[PDB]
Write an enzyme that holds these catalytic residues in place. Structure first.
Site, PDB file in Angstrom:
ATOM      1  N   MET A  94      32.335  41.582 -15.849  1.00 31.69           N
ATOM      2  CA  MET A  94      33.213  40.420 -16.057  1.00 31.69           C
ATOM      3  C   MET A  94      34.498  40.790 -16.796  1.00 31.69           C
ATOM      4  O   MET A  94      35.000  40.025 -17.618  1.00 31.69           O
ATOM      5  CB  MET A  94      32.470  39.286 -16.780  1.00 31.69           C
ATOM      6  CG  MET A  94      31.333  38.681 -15.974  1.00 31.69           C
ATOM      7  SD  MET A  94      31.901  37.915 -14.441  1.00 31.69           S
ATOM      8  CE  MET A  94      32.721  36.450 -15.067  1.00 31.69           C
TER       9      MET A  94
ATOM     10  N   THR B 235      37.124  38.847 -18.711  1.00 29.17           N
ATOM     11  CA  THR B 235      38.034  37.806 -18.150  1.00 29.17           C
ATOM     12  C   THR B 235      39.472  38.103 -18.553  1.00 29.17           C
ATOM     13  O   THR B 235      39.788  38.196 -19.738  1.00 29.17           O
ATOM     14  CB  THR B 235      37.655  36.389 -18.630  1.00 29.17           C
ATOM     15  OG1 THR B 235      36.291  36.112 -18.284  1.00 29.17           O
ATOM     16  CG2 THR B 235      38.564  35.331 -17.992  1.00 29.17           C
ATOM     17  N   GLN B 236      40.332  38.241 -17.548  1.00 29.25           N
ATOM     18  CA  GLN B 236      41.723  38.609 -17.743  1.00 29.25           C
ATOM     19  C   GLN B 236      42.637  37.580 -17.095  1.00 29.25           C
ATOM     20  O   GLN B 236      42.181  36.663 -16.411  1.00 29.25           O
ATOM     21  CB  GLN B 236      41.998  39.962 -17.082  1.00 29.25           C
ATOM     22  CG  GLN B 236      41.433  41.170 -17.803  1.00 29.25           C
ATOM     23  CD  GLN B 236      42.049  42.479 -17.318  1.00 29.25           C
ATOM     24  OE1 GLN B 236      43.215  42.527 -16.903  1.00 29.25           O
ATOM     25  NE2 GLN B 236      41.269  43.552 -17.374  1.00 29.25           N
TER      26      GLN B 236
END
Ligand SMILES: *[C@@](C)(CO)[C@](*)(O)[C@H](CC(C)C)NC(=O)[C@H](Cc1ccccc1)NC(=O)[C@H](CC(C)C)NC(=O)[C@H](CCc1ccccc1)NC(=O)CN1CCOCC1
Lengths: 244, 195, 233, 222, 212, 235, 231, 240
Positions: free
Chosen positions: C107, C1-2
């Site tokens: 992810m 997740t970024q």
């Protein structure tokens, strides 16, 4: 590779014997004799220290007789360093059992587990076996007073009287001669010392070359007491039986 | 699962456990036995999360039976209860804990005494003269505080137990479909068929 | 997740009769702050492929290094590295598409929208899109970000379907791209006036144009606009 | 927060005849209110007379098709070039989908071909691998529009024999390839009218014992 | 879904509907909710479709391996417990399964086990499972006797599914009937609710709530 | 000593070649393939008369359409059979079909060379794998611990193999009936066996498309033994 | 002698005896021939049987639509190496949408075989391979040896009495290399080549095994009545 | 981990480590199993070079695996404990998953499978143990007697013996045991078992252990006096 230098410690001979176990037993046969005698009202553990030097500190010494818990003790014959590895494991195992069940460990259960560890070293791992034979002396509320022995093979058996280490053949004959079932502790104490005195490779049996212990119900009412004898107490018991 | 009761009297331990297995708005079964015999003189009732209850009960049962075969000897109720507590105490700090509360009724043959242990899913053990898990206790404890005596017979204990079940049937919201009653004494474990 | 930090805006492109054109401005935005102005977002691979990248610039630089390393690896034990076994646009794309989808599946995506423009060894035009989700598609015109909303409508007036490609010259095609870049400068708040443009032609090869500027802009009508309804001055 | 899924729109349709089967799908590819491509095929010939389409999230759709195509290849290598039957393919696809039960492929999968008796077969899958053989199935964005029409026109649902007092049902019969293609084209033009994600082009893959044939038709581009 | 199975004098009746839903969308009217594990074992399906379908056909593979290894058909108890122990390993992961393992063996006789996805395993004589289970219970319980004939038992199972198919919005399609004996399971046909409802209404005189 | 996966100067793996000697010591197993089915027969060879011969399990089912006979260190076959059964059932689960006999044999033979310094030594048992599938029909395979498998029309393995194989060379033809094959296995087993052949020290089995794999009863085999003796005396 | 106990030991003259013994297993194997023109590449393999009742050991394996090999020596080792090639060809297709170059295929086999000759515990592969293929640079033929050495050739042969076929191809080089756009004639040349390695036995219908790959020809294998044309 | 292949093939096709494990069994004290019409009896030799033993606590030669199955052995005593423990764990595991106790064949097959695993696993030697496993299947009255050995092979026996001088007692059983008519009662079965051990043992005092297993988990071990009565009876009939 490394195959070249592998002794193969866990293999059978053509005759179906485990080389390393047999050679470990040969090692143990040169160790100081240890005797266990089980009476109706207690157990005696007697052991001969290996050729003592006069400058050895005798009172603060422990070579043969060790405490596993309040109800169980062992007499050692073989490599002391090997025995201490196993003793600490046995001590931990007893505490695990107590922690789990809130009851002191039954003698045989402790003996079996310690013997199972030895067995493992003869069947897998490629390591040398422990060069140690134990005499287990203990009490529990199921079987009462119990004597066991285990050896490097991991095989254990129960006894009324037994010896390990040096001169077991001669020692076992003498025990088999004078032992009887209705025997008391004080009589067993005398038998143990008399047997060592005859089988010893030394000139004369003295207090400084012995370790001694009893497991009686000689405490106050329905409880067991472990007595690891002090030097002066061994000196007195040796005079009391007329050996010195 | 819901109602499990236990009463230790003079010479025995009596366990009562509800027969209903309810899911959603349907009573799927009205004859469910919420207990397992751990050894000839030790019985464990259980209540809590679906699936967990039986899975835990049978897991304990297997372990105690294994011990019995290995040593050719029956573990004391105290020893069994300590083993069970430790398993639950391990479980509560696991990834997914067993959500199971238990009563352990046993007869110690060495002491010649009945013993009742109450253990919750956290691993909280207590020895009691009478015990209950879940909402049952909120009615039965006060009732037993009044009517219980330590020297009662098995028959007096069953009448005392009937008094609990009647009160629960009167004041409990849910229909738990009666109880299966079992007695643990010197002669082992037997079920009362007409309750 | 970024979350993307330093970002590049639209990449636009189209096919024409002999090849493909691709363009992207030289801006590295930092939110609303127009932070960096010398950012090259078109990266050539060999003499037959240009990869245009929008989105996170740190991830763009990572992708640059992968493409750079791909050229090196292809040259290993390859006597035909500059001939029959040279890197094709389709090889480069499929590699990137694999990486993009693998990263989204873990992810931890590369926060980018990518357009691989080039010409295959047989002369065929190659133009295909891939993004942070691993979604891929091809079209006569392709655009990212605001370009999808504003450039595509303009470029599709030139090449509306496959049959319009042979009818479209490099002069007409480049004119539409340059016009689209102007429209984006009018209307995209994270765009710059400066941009790069690349042409990959099956005859003339790779032509990389740097330091282009939007020009011929209509601003004069602004002087007549007063107030927001009533106001006459 | 990063959302790993997306909706690429489009719709697909599989019908089975007596000695044939069709698998149709529009060629429009979208995201939100934008068109990505007017011609992006999503109905593929996978070999062994099996056609396949995985509609919904295109990245997952392509991944699945790619893996199944690869599964067909390895089936040949491991079982002496044996033909993968449609029923075996279907079971294999279930395991592909269910393998990602806890991070699913976001697609409605349909495959079509011939069974081992030479008869037309259509299988359809939910995102996590539940499958069923059917004469008829619509999948994707406009599935809810097309499917009831197919129930009525292919399986003759709610249609009774005239004058029989609603007592005798309209008898089931196989449709010709000509009649099936008429229903496919009308289904997609109707879906194009009333669904915004459906349009641009229609691509039909017809499967017979002779092989896999293709047909293409224009759809409205608004 | 609505599924039931009940034990009686002449063995076991098993009845299920055939509907499959995705929310309010009726996805299928022709789903097979009974799995034929072997000639003496049946499994019913309710809940998540592939969860049921996948793991029950997996169960069939495990049962086959048992009879290869043990040279003996698996017991209903052991078969049900393989499934219950499997789903218990997945407890909390979000599997959705309400199943019934029905069958006959020599040592057990006719046996039914309820098994669900939160690990509940129950032996019993009557169970109804699914969104329309309560509707099935209402008819089944009020007409059930142990001494039902094979003919009456088959009808009651059919009629109970019909009752649920009618009232429960997420049940319908058709009724699949099975009868399990000492000789194995016997299929008793697919019965479309489209025709069955009106046939039952006319012949039985029931369903007076509906406009005839 | 020396490595387990060592080559001899002749280009053979020592351990594989030594395992082949162990198989020669094993009890005889014969398989014959026909167009009506495949027959598998074995010598039980009870070490003592007190041993209950019906507990000697040297013919084994892998699936309904595949059977297996063994010879050599028969304890080593257990994990091979377990793998074969799992392979067969797993394939049915993945593909909703029966698995090809050749593919099953290939799966078993993949275990063979998974030894070294994986298991510590090769298998000391050879297998005859008989079966049927829709593609290649009735098939018989000989699976060795070398990882190699040959298809055979007929094959003998074990102590009397070279003598029995020479006999099978003369007797086998492409038009053999199932009954003719049954008698032929019994005939050749009786020749190479030490003790006198009967229903208790020899076991028959077959695999047919219709009825699948079946191990014969001692009553059924006894009648075939009696039928065999009468036919040899009849000329 | 004292230096052949394992692959990790060098002899005093710098030889690896285990690798040489693995090489010896190939010489015992049945003959197989490889040759190519500019348009096609052909494998011809003499299959071997245990006896008249047995089948004939299959020598040729397909790796991709455009590549495959023939084997001589330990067949299980060929299965391991062919499977590895199948995966590498397949990796190239899925990841790069690119058919694996036959030259890279050889480099990959070399490096896989090599690792087994430098580490304790493992053993060298006991099989030789002839890889044919048609890629972006035309037809190819490779010879793999389990020492790790891979060699690209116009034609070759490995196995027992392979020197006969290898001498023939060395004479015929100028002829068969120019057999372009004619599959049957290139096979005929390969069948005549393998015939020079025959002793007492001749090429029969269930004995001969032929494979071909080329410009407009996927890798396909011919056995049984399909090779009766070439006898 | 220690990886060495200890059990390997020799040129003549023998696995010497497995065969040397049989020699350990041949050294072990004699054990005999005889099954009657409604019972199985497990007899075991105990060597008399060990006096001053404590027979209360000394590990018994016959071990209960479950309430309905028993296991005796010949060979290395320490090795036997490992097999017994595994067998007991598998017995409880079987009850847990199958909701039914193990069959005698199943339990034997497991123990035999363990022994086999140790003959082709790296870093381990085979068990120097052969077992006799006896009992009754759940809800069954047919007696079961099985034998296992280090190699991993197992089989069913009407009557069998293992250990030292087992060939002598096997010779005895082979002529004294009738397949058509097994020992009809418990007494007959025990007597035949004791008789067979008296061919080898020495004295019938504290050298013979007898354990009788009957259907429905009915297992009991005979005491010294009970066994001594059989010894006294047999010797008086012998003098004839
Ligand atoms: C009665 C009929 C109602 O419960 C029965 O219980 C039947 C059981 C039979 C079929 C074995 N149950 C269903 O039909 C079941 C209801 C349900 C749905 C979701 C969770 C639990 C229970 N329906 C399904 O399982 C359907 C199967 C058909 C073929 C559509 N599947 C879905 O709804 C799928 C997968 C759901 C899912 C489960 C677990 C993890 C992830 C997903 N979902 C979709 O297809 C999504 N949807 C389809 C429409 O297009 C938009 C996306």
């Amino acid at each position: 590779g490394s195959r070249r230098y592998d002794s193969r410690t866990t293999i059978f001979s053509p005759e179906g014997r485990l080389y390393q176990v047999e050679y470990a037993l040969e090692s143990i046969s040169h160790a100081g004799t240890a005797i266990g005698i089980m009476a109706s009202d207690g157990i005696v553990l007697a052991a001969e220290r290996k050729v003592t030097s006069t400058l050895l500190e005798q009172d603060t010494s422990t070579e043969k007789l060790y405490k596993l818990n309040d109800k169980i003790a062992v007499a050692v014959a073989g490599l002391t360093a090997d025995a201490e590895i196993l003793i600490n494991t046995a001590r931990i195992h007893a505490q695990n059992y107590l922690k789990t069940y809130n009851e002191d460990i039954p003698v045989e259960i402790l003996v079996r587990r310690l013997s199972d560890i030895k067995q493992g070293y003869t069947q897998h791992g490629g390591l040398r076996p422990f060069g140690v034979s134990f005499i287990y002396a203990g009490y529990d509320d199921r079987y009462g007073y119990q004597l066991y022995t285990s050896n490097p093979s991991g095989n254990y058996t129960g006894w009324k009287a037994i010896s390990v280490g040096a001169n077991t053949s001669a020692a076992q004959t003498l025990l088999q001669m004078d032992y009887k079932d209705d025997m008391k502790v004080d009589d067993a104490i005398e038998l143990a010392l008399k047997t060592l005195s005859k089988t010893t490779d030394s000139s004369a049996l003295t207090y400084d070359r012995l370790e001694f212990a009893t497991i009686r119900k000689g405490a106050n009412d329905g409880e067991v007491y472990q007595k690891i004898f002090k030097p002066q107490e061994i000196k007195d018991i040796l005079v009391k039986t007329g050996i010195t | 699962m819901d109602i499990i009761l236990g009463i230790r009297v003079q010479d025995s331990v009596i366990l009562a456990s509800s027969k209903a297995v309810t899911r959603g708005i349907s009573v799927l079964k009205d004859s469910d036995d919420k207990t397992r015999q751990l050894s000839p003189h030790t019985l464990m009732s259980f209540a809590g999360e679906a699936g967990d209850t039986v899975q835990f009960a049978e897991y304990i049962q297997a372990n105690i039976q294994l011990y019995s075969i290995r040593e050719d000897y029956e573990l004391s109720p105290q020893a069994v209860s300590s083993f069970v507590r430790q398993e639950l105490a391990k479980s509560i700090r696991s990834r997914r804990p067993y959500q199971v509360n238990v009563l352990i009724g046993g007869y110690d043959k060495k002491k010649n005494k009945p013993e009742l242990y109450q253990i919750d899913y956290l691993g909280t053990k207590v020895e009691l003269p009478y015990g209950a898990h879940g909402y049952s206790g909120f009615y039965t404890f006060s009732l037993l505080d009044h009517h219980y005596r330590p020297d009662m017979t098995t028959e007096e204990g069953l009448d005392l137990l009937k008094l609990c079940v009647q009160e629960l049937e009167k004041r409990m919201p849910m229909d738990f479909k009666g109880v299966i009653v079992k007695i643990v004494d010197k002669d082992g474990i037997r079920q009362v068929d007409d309750f | 997740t970024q979350q993307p930090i330093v970002t590049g805006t639209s990449v636009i492109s189209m096919k024409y009769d002999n090849g493909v054109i691709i363009a992207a401005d030289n801006l590295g935005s930092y939110g609303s702050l127009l932070r960096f102005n010398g950012v090259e977002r078109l990266i050539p691979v060999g003499d037959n492929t240009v990869v245009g990248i929008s989105g996170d610039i740190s991830d763009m630089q990572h992708i640059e290094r992968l493409l750079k390393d791909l050229v090196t690896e292809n040259a290993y034990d390859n006597p035909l590295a500059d001939a029959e076994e040279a890197l094709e646009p389709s090889y480069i794309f499929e590699y990137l598409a694999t990486v993009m989808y693998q990263r989204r599946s873990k992810m931890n995506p590369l926060w980018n929208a990518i357009i691989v423009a080039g010409v295959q060894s047989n002369g065929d035009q190659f133009l295909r899109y891939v993004n942070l989700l691993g979604v891929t598609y091809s079209s006569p015109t392709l655009a990212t970000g605001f370009g999808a909303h504003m450039a595509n409508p303009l470029l599709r007036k030139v090449v509306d379907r496959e049959s319009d490609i042979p009818k479209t010259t490099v002069q007409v095609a480049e004119e539409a791209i340059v016009n689209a870049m102007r429209v984006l400068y009018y209307r995209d708040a994270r765009s710059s006036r400066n941009f790069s443009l690349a042409i990959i032609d099956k005859n003339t090869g790779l032509t990389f144009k740097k330091n282009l500027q939007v020009e011929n802009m209509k601003w004069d009508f602004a002087k007549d606009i007063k107030g927001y309804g009533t106001q006459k001055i | 927060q990063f959302n790993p899924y997306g909706d690429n729109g489009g719709t697909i349709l599989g019908i089975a005849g007596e000695d044939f089967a069709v698998l149709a799908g529009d060629t429009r590819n979208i995201t939100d209110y934008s068109i990505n491509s007017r011609y992006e095929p999503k109905v593929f010939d996978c070999g062994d007379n099996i056609v396949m389409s995985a509609n919904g999230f295109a990245a997952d759709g392509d991944a699945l098709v790619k893996r199944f195509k690869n599964s067909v290849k390895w089936y040949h290598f491991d079982h002496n070039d044996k033909k993968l039957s449609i029923n075996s393919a279907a079971r294999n696809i279930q395991h592909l989908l269910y393998g990602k039960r806890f991070f699913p492929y976001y697609v409605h999968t349909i495959i079509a071909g011939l069974d081992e008796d030479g008869k037309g077969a259509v299988y359809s899958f939910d995102p996590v691998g539940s499958y069923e053989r059917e004469q008829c199935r619509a999948g994707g964005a406009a599935a809810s529009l097309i499917m009831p029409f197919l129930d009525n026109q292919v399986n003759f649902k709610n249609q009774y024999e005239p004058g029989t007092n609603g007592k005798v049902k309209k008898p089931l019969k196989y449709l010709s390839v000509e009649e099936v293609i008429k229903l496919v084209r009308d289904s997609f033009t109707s879906a194009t009218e009333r669904h915004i994600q459906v349009g641009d082009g229609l691509e039909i893959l017809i499967v017979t014992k002779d092989g896999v044939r293709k047909e293409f038709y224009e759809l409205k581009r608004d | 879904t609505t599924t039931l199975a009940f034990r009686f004098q002449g063995g076991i009746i098993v009845a299920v509907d055939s509907r499959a839903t995705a929310g309010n969308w009726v996805a299928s009217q022709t789903v097979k909710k009974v799995i034929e594990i072997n000639p003496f074992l049946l499994g019913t399906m309710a809940g998540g479709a592939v969860d049921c379908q996948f793991w029950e056909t997996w169960l069939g593979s495990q049962c086959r391996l048992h009879e290869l290894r043990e040279k003996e058909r698996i017991s209903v108890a052991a078969a049900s417990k393989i499934l219950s122990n499997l789903v218990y390993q997945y407890k909390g992961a979000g599997l959705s399964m309400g199943t019934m393992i029905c069958g006959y063996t020599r040592k057990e006789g006719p046996t039914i086990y309820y098994v669900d996805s939160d690990g509940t395993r129950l032996k019993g004589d009557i169970f109804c499972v699914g969104s329309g289970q309560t509707f099935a219970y209402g008819v089944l319980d009020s007409n059930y006797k142990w001494d039902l004939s094979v003919e009456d038992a088959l009808y009651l199972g059919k009629r109970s599914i019909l009752a649920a198919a009618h009232r429960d919005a997420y049940s319908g399609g058709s009724v699949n009937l099975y009868h399990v004996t000492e000789d194995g399971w016997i299929y008793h046909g697919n019965h479309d609710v489209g025709e069955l409802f009106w046939k039952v209404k006319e012949e039985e005189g029931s369903f007076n709530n509906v406009i005839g | 000593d020396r490595g387990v996966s060592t080559f001899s100067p002749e280009g053979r793996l020592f351990q594989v070649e030594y395992s082949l000697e162990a198989i020669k010591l094993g009890s005889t197993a014969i398989g014959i393939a026909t167009k009506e089915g495949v027959v598998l027969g074995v010598e039980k060879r009870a070490t003592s008369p007190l041993l209950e011969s019906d507990s000697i399990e040297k013919i084994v089912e892998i699936d309904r359409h595949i059977g297996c006979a063994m010879s050599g260190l028969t304890a080593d076959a257990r994990s091979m059979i377990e793998h074969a059964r799992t392979a067969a059932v797993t394939h049915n689960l993945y593909y909703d079909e029966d698995i090809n006999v050749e593919s099953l044999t290939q799966s078993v033979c993949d275990l063979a060379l998974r030894f070294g310094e994986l298991m510590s030594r090769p298998f000391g048992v050879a297998l005859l794998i008989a079966g049927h599938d829709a593609d290649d029909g009735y098939q018989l395979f000989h699976a060795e611990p070398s990882g190699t498998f040959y298809r055979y029309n007929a094959k003998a393995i074990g102590s009397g193999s070279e003598g029995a194989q020479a006999e099978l060379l003369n007797e086998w033809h492409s038009s053999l009936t199932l009954k003719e094959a049954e008698l032929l296995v019994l005939k050749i087993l009786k020749q190479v066996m030490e003790e006198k052949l009967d229903e208790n020290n020899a076991q028959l089995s077959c695999i047919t498309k219709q009825d699948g794999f079946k191990i014969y009863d001692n009553e059924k085999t006894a009648e075939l033994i009696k039928e065999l003796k009468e036919k040899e005396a009849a000329e | 002698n004292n230096y052949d106990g394992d692959t990790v030991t060098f002899s005093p003259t710098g030889r690896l005896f285990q690798v040489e013994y693995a090489l010896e297993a190939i010489k015992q194997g049945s003959v197989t021939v490889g040759l190519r023109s500019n348009t096609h590449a052909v494998l011809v393999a003499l299959k071997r049987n245990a006896d008249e009742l047995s089948s004939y050991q299959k020598k040729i394996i397909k790796c991709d639509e455009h590549m495959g090999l023939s084997l001589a020596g330990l067949a299980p080792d060929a299965r391991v190496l062919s499977n590895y090639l199948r995966q590498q060809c397949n990796y190239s297709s899925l990841v790069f949408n690119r058919k694996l170059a036959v030259e890279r295929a050889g480099h990959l086999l070399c490096d896989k075989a090599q690792k087994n000759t430098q580490s304790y515990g493992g053993r060298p592969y006991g099989v030789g391979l002839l890889i044919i293929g048609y890629d972006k640079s035309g037809a190819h033929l490779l010879e793999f040896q389990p020492s790790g050495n891979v060699t690209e050739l116009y034609g070759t042969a490995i196995g027992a009495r392979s020197q006969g076929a290898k001498t023939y191809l060395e004479r015929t080089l100028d002829t068969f290399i120019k057999i372009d756009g004619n599959p049957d004639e290139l096979i005929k040349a390969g069948v005549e080549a393998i015939s020079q390695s025959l002793r007492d036995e001749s090429l029969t219908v269930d004995n001969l095994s032929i494979a071909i790959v080329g410009k407009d020809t996927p890798f396909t294998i011919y056995d049984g009545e399909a090779v009766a044309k070439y006898i | 981990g220690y990886d060495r292949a200890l059990s390997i093939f020799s040129p003549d096709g023998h696995i010497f480590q497995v065969e040397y494990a049989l020699e350990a069994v041949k050294r072990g004290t004699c054990a005999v199993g005889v099954k009657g019409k409604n019972c199985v009896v497990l007899g075991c030799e105990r060597r008399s070079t060990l006096k001053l033993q404590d027979t209360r606590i000394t590990p018994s030669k016959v071990s209960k695996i479950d309430s309905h199955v028993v296991l005796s052995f010949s060979g290395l005593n320490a090795d036997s404990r490992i097999l017994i423990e595994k067998a007991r764990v598998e017995a409880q595991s079987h009850r847990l998953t199958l909701e039914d106790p193990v069959t005698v064949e199943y339990l034997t097959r497991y123990v035999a499978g363990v022994q086999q695993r140790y003959t082709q696993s790296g870093g381990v030697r085979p068990f120097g143990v052969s077992t006799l496993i006896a009992g009754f299947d759940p809800r069954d009255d047919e007696p079961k007697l099985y034998q296992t050995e280090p190699s991993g092979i197992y089989s069913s026996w009407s009557a069998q013996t293992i250990g030292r001088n087992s060939k002598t007692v096997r010779e005895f059983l082979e002529k004294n045991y009738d397949r058509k008519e097994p020992p009809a009662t418990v007494e007959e079965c025990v007597k035949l078992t004791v008789r067979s051990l008296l061919e080898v043992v020495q004295t019938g005092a504290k050298n013979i252990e007898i354990t009788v297993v009957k259907p429905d988990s009915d297992i009991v071990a005979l005491s010294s006096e009970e066994i001594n009565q059989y010894v006294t009876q047999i010797e008086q009939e012998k003098q004839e």
